[PDB]
């Protein structure tokens, strides 16, 4: 009765949203960028192989200084790496070994940590004691921590396997804002460059654009066929790319509210675990399950290059803030740095 | 060419390398296990010694068994955390015929998952006493839930447990064959289901886990020496 008419109203609203997106789809991004020059063969070589993790790496997050990077591997350790010299700056033992995410605070004073413990653990790096101490444990999620990103030293937005995202106040330990609306496990998170918004890819084949302050889902982006494991904003904040299990990467405009370009190839069968843009956004790098990373021309959907140096599943990428290098973490317990 | 502080940072990195090596040697001494099964399976009563971690030691070999109860029913992403465990402990209520196909589908999804393609499964067909009482009562029939059981017979070249009715033996062999056929349908022998029948009062399950993990590491060694 009421549920059937609500489902019909949802169907009509989805139909008119699709018609609005079709009316705004005058010409594709491939037709616009057909006349510009291709990037050629982007050939990055492994500069640093960061060794010392002893189980599979799930997540790595560069520092904003573009030198330090934290990496999360399920040996119960968060290693911070002086990527220029391959020096391990900190080894952070974790109370739960099953880490699935790590963040690096933009100030550099904190790292985050989360996974199957359903807890985003905040670790202080600038303690007077000289060790890395647990600053705060954020224990409100009823599903696994899949991604977390600091906005500053006091606020962190965490995606989770309980189909929600949460904005936290680290000093109080409480959820300032809960972001609900996903129906699958939210696997990835990407903050906007101004940190006003963030996108979240989930296991419902949908990416949702959230507002951090007012707390609602502003836009919902469909087009993928399987679980979105990976999400990354375009550097202007107007677009974002996703990576999914359907062996495709897709680029979505916020303002056009639809897909712009699909990054896929015929022999690519495996899903995407990690996506990242270059500093200009021209190169979309994507980490795959077939142990490689494919560099995509983000404007032309062309396979620019292959970062093939990992002997197991690539689980995380990270491009530096100055764009100098890409670090690829993988399940072979290694972090390779490419440029 | 390094500075005084750059050299001392390398020394701190070397100490961190040494501590990580020591922690890795400590972590490789224990065998990580993933405890899986439905809510009626009796997972927590298998070994008598959000994540429920059970540590037990058989013949001075440490075992770390992980039970994940802190997640919701969608498991396709967090099950990839356990690619590198020695074994997956899959516990099945053998008496519950209605959820037996659900357990078979769960085992088939575990068995054919790409990141679980290399992990052997220690299958515990739990509550075989309740299975025996359900078979001897004759009220609940397996043929209603599994029509191929009616044309199933106990193999002639088989060894029943002593003191067992051959109806209970045929039921046990059929449920074990239902899991073993899924196990041998794919995987090419790189991972092996080890099926055991288990009571609620059975105290041999730690020894069974020890013997099966012994066979798992034995298979890893034999594949390392090209001995299959």
């Amino acid at each position, epitope marked *: 009765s009421e549920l059937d008419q609500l489902r019909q109203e949802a169907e009509q609203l989805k139909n008119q949203i699709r018609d609005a997106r079709k009316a705004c789809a005058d010409a594709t991004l491939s037709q616009i960028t057909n006349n510009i020059d291709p990037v050629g063969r982007i050939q990055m070589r492994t500069r640093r192989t960061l060794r010392g993790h002893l189980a599979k790496i799930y997540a790595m997050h560069w520092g904003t200084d573009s030198r330090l990077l934290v990496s999360a591997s399920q040996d119960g350790k968060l290693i911070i790496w002086d990527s220029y010299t391959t020096n391990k700056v900190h080894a952070i033992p974790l109370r739960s070994s099953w880490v699935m995410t790590c963040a690096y605070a933009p100030s550099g004073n904190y790292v985050a940590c989360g996974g199957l413990d359903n807890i985003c653990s905040i670790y202080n790096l600038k303690t*007077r004691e*000289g060790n890395v101490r647990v600053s705060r444990e954020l224990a409100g999620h009823t599903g696994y921590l899949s991604c977390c990103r600091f906005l500053d030293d006091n606020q962190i937005v965490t995606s989770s396997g309980d189909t929600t995202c949460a904005l936290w106040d680290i000093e109080t330990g409480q959820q300032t804002t809960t972001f609900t609306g996903h129906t699958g496990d939210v696997m990835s998170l990407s903050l906007a460059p101004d940190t006003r918004l963030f996108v979240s890819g989930a296991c419902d084949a949908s990416a949702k654009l959230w507002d951090v302050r007012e707390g609602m889902c502003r836009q919902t982006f469909t087009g993928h066929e399987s679980d979105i494991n990976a999400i990354c904003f375009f550097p202007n904040g107007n677009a974002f790319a996703t990576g999914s299990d359907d062996a495709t990467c897709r680029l979505f405009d916020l303002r056009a509210d639809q897909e712009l370009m699909t990054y896929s190839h015929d022999n690519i069968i495996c899903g995407i675990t990690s996506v990242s843009f270059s500093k200009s956004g021209r190169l979309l790098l994507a980490g795959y399950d077939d142990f490689n990373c494919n560099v995509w021309d983000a404007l032309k959907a062309d396979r620019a290059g292959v970062l093939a140096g990992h002997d197991n599943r690539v689980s995380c990428l990270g491009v530096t803030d100055d764009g100098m290098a890409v670090a690829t973490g993988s399940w072979d317990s290694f972090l390779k740095i490419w440029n | 060419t390094l500075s*005084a*502080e750059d050299k001392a*940072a390398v020394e*701190r990195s070397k100490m961190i390398d040494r501590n990580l090596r020591e922690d890795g040697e400590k972590a490789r001494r224990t065998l990580r296990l993933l405890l899986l099964g439905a809510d009626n399976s009796g997972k927590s009563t298998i070994v008598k010694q959000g994540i429920f971690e059970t540590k037990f030691q058989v013949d001075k070999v440490n075992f770390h068994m992980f039970d994940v109860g802190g997640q919701r029913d969608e498991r396709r992403k967090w099950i990839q955390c356990f690619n590198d465990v020695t074994a997956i402990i899959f516990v099945v209520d053998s008496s519950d015929y209605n959820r037996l196909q659900e357990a078979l589908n769960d085992f088939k999804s575990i068995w054919n998952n790409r990141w679980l393609r290399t992990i052997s499964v220690i299958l515990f067909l739990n509550k075989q006493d309740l299975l025996a009482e359900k078979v001897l009562a004759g009220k609940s029939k397996i043929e209603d839930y599994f029509p191929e059981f009616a044309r199933y017979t106990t193999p002639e070249d088989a060894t029943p447990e002593p003191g067992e009715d051959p109806r209970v033996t045929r039921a046990k062999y059929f449920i074990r064959k239902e899991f073993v056929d899924i196990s041998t349908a794919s995987g090419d022998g790189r991972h092996i289901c080890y099926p055991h029948f288990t009571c609620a009062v059975d105290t041999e399950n730690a020894r069974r886990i020890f013997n099966d993990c012994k066979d798992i590491i034995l298979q890893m060694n034999l594949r390392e020496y090209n001995l299959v």
Partner: single-chain antibody
Amino acid sequence: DVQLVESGGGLVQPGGSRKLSCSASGFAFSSFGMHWVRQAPEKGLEWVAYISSGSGTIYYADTVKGRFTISRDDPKNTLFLQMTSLRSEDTAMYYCVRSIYYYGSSPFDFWGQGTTLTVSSGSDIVMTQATSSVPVTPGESVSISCRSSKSLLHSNGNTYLYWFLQRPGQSPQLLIYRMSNLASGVPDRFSGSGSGTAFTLTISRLEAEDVGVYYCMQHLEYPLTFGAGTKLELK
């Protein structure tokens, strides 16, 4: 609270032996490389010895090389300075200094209160301070200049000059590490700039608690050498 307490100092006859113990509390002692820095009553700070974290690398000053032995016991959280064949030049206040070394670390950040040892009676980077006493008033900007015989700028981009403030009757504290970075607990008024050889410590909006002797120290290469020291006096 991070605390280093020195003990074992006393009146020793020349040529004798004396043991200095530095008790560490309130911090992870085994992760910090440790230093001994002595200060004669008629001189400034002088680096004595350095034991690393984990006791892997040990450096001594050439004045105390062979005579002195530095050691630590990490489970007991203590730092030891075995001194043998003591001379009258060793009459000084020996400071226990912790120093951790990673990227962006703050070495020489905390110093012990010191113990008083009394004895009766070339290739080193020369660190020069052009002035030794600057008459200052509160509310006035003061620049403390320091110079180095060797360029402290390294090929990695870091310029290893360290600024210290020793208030009268108090242990030295770290103000500026690696020529530009503010140490923890130091206000934003303390600023440091340098060109690799010439260095300065820009101090603005002076207060009465900022007085004391200001030392510049290089950490480019062992042996670590301090400046002569610039004392600030009110009015």
